[PDB]
Design an enzyme around this catalytic site. Structure first.
Site, PDB file in Angstrom:
ATOM      1  N   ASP A 148     -16.639 -41.110 -72.743  1.00 28.45           N
ATOM      2  CA  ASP A 148     -16.195 -40.319 -71.748  1.00 28.45           C
ATOM      3  C   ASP A 148     -16.116 -41.122 -70.501  1.00 28.45           C
ATOM      4  O   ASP A 148     -15.630 -42.377 -70.448  1.00 28.45           O
ATOM      5  CB  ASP A 148     -17.166 -38.968 -71.715  1.00 28.45           C
ATOM      6  CG  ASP A 148     -16.420 -38.026 -70.758  1.00 28.45           C
ATOM      7  OD1 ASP A 148     -15.979 -36.939 -71.423  1.00 28.45           O
ATOM      8  OD2 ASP A 148     -16.322 -37.995 -69.547  1.00 28.45           O
ATOM      9  N   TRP A 149     -16.348 -40.668 -69.351  1.00 28.77           N
ATOM     10  CA  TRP A 149     -16.392 -41.303 -68.202  1.00 28.77           C
ATOM     11  C   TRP A 149     -17.321 -42.595 -67.849  1.00 28.77           C
ATOM     12  O   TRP A 149     -17.210 -43.580 -67.152  1.00 28.77           O
ATOM     13  CB  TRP A 149     -16.523 -40.510 -66.762  1.00 28.77           C
ATOM     14  CG  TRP A 149     -15.238 -39.533 -66.377  1.00 28.77           C
ATOM     15  CD1 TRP A 149     -15.052 -38.520 -66.864  1.00 28.77           C
ATOM     16  CD2 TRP A 149     -14.551 -40.588 -65.545  1.00 28.77           C
ATOM     17  NE1 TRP A 149     -13.736 -38.114 -65.848  1.00 28.77           N
ATOM     18  CE2 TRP A 149     -13.537 -39.275 -65.231  1.00 28.77           C
ATOM     19  CE3 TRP A 149     -14.491 -41.426 -64.589  1.00 28.77           C
ATOM     20  CZ2 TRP A 149     -12.478 -39.645 -64.200  1.00 28.77           C
ATOM     21  CZ3 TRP A 149     -13.430 -41.876 -63.705  1.00 28.77           C
ATOM     22  CH2 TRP A 149     -12.466 -40.831 -63.736  1.00 28.77           C
ATOM     23  N   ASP A 193     -13.221 -35.068 -82.117  1.00 25.03           N
ATOM     24  CA  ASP A 193     -13.017 -35.326 -80.700  1.00 25.03           C
ATOM     25  C   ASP A 193     -11.328 -35.205 -80.548  1.00 25.03           C
ATOM     26  O   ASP A 193     -10.781 -36.251 -80.264  1.00 25.03           O
ATOM     27  CB  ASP A 193     -13.694 -36.282 -80.015  1.00 25.03           C
ATOM     28  CG  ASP A 193     -13.443 -36.071 -78.607  1.00 25.03           C
ATOM     29  OD1 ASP A 193     -12.687 -35.143 -78.253  1.00 25.03           O
ATOM     30  OD2 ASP A 193     -13.810 -37.257 -77.839  1.00 25.03           O
TER      31      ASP A 193
HETATM   32 CL   LIG Z   1     -13.197 -35.411 -67.312  1.00 23.08          CL
END
Ligand SMILES: [Cl-]
Ligand SMILES: [Cl-]
Ligand code: NA
Length: 309
Positions: free
Chosen positions: A123-124, A250
């Protein structure tokens, strides 16, 4: 900027989490400072494994991975991004920018003087971490990426991300636990969900969680677009080990491993795989499996060195 600090009682007796807090202060960029929480586990002199979380999680996401890593002799650093976890939380959504998040994690690297790092990002944690790799070649030894990306804004981000970005901004209240449930393929216990909500007593603490999806570059004029183009040109020269460990369930990031394998020279030769039975938050669904693969990745890619180096 103003900051909120989550009361410590929120973090009492969380499932499978008993890691002592460490803290450092970072410049807030507005003439003050804010506190960053991080975990620092394993042998003091061992090469560090840096575990970066993203939206809207915290280092708790890594709790099943950390013991496997430290049992294998690795030092582990797992920071909480400002806005999240046990870190201080800027009080306005406009306080959070991509560049600030990069700078805050850069300050962690600098203050801890981390070198020979194996990054694991998701993710980030990858939007930030891959920038850090590009901008600090000499600090990183290896990279593992799962369920992440590094958009420049020059291309469409796809069905899954677009749905998430729209939902995240439309909802009246931001349900952090709800987001974790939506991004996993396991029927999480309520006590685990409660641990994801622990940083956020009420809505006033959630401004970083609410801003993050808007910070993903989706246009070529984003304030981070060029910095991410530049990062990709550095990654196109990254010859050190790079493994992809994306999961099977995902849609937000599906297939994103293929562009990494195409572009990044250090992916050639690495035993990439697809983590079965894992959602977006694959560390929650499949933490043991992922950690074992990360241990194996480090083992398969020795760093030859003298003592103290
Ligand atoms: Cl996000
Ligand atoms: Cl919830
Ligand atoms: Na490759």
């Amino acid at each position: 900027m103003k900051i909120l600090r989550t009361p410590d009682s929120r973090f009492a007796n969380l499932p499978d989490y008993n890691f002592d807090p460490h803290y450092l202060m970072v410049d807030d960029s507005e003439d003050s400072e804010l506190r960053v929480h991080y975990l620092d586990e394993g042998p003091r002199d061992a090469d560090p494994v840096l575990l970066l979380h993203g939206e809207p999680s915290w280092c708790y996401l890594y709790r099943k991975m950390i013991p496997i890593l430290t049992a294998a002799g690795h030092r582990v650093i797992a920071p909480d991004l400002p806005g999240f976890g046990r870190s201080d939380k800027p009080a306005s959504r406009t306080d959070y920018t991509y560049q600030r998040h990069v700078n805050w994690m850069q300050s962690v690297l600098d203050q801890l003087d981390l070198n020979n790092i194996t990054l694991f990002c998701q993710d980030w944690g990858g939007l930030i971490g891959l920038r850090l790799v590009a901008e600090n070649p000499d600090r990183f030894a290896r990279v593992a990426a799962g369920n992440t990306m590094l958009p420049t804004g020059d291309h469409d981000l796809g069905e899954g991300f677009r749905k998430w970005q729209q939902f995240s901004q439309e909802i009246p209240q931001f349900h952090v636990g709800g987001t974790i449930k939506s991004g996993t393929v396991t029927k999480l216990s309520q006590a685990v969900i409660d641990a994801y909500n622990a940083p956020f007593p009420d809505e006033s603490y959630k401004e970083g969680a609410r801003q993050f999806p808007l910070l993903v570059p989706s246009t070529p004029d984003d304030p981070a677009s060029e910095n991410n183009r530049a990062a990709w040109i550095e990654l196109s020269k990254w010859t050190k080990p790079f493994i992809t460990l994306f999961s099977d369930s995902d849609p937000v990031t599906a297939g994103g491993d293929r562009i990494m394998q195409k572009i990044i020279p250090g992916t050639k030769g690495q035993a990439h795989t697809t983590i079965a039975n894992g959602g977006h938050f694959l560390q929650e669904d499949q933490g043991e499996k992922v950690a074992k693969l990360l241990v194996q990745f480090i083992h398969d890619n020795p760093r030859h060195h003298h003592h103290h180096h």
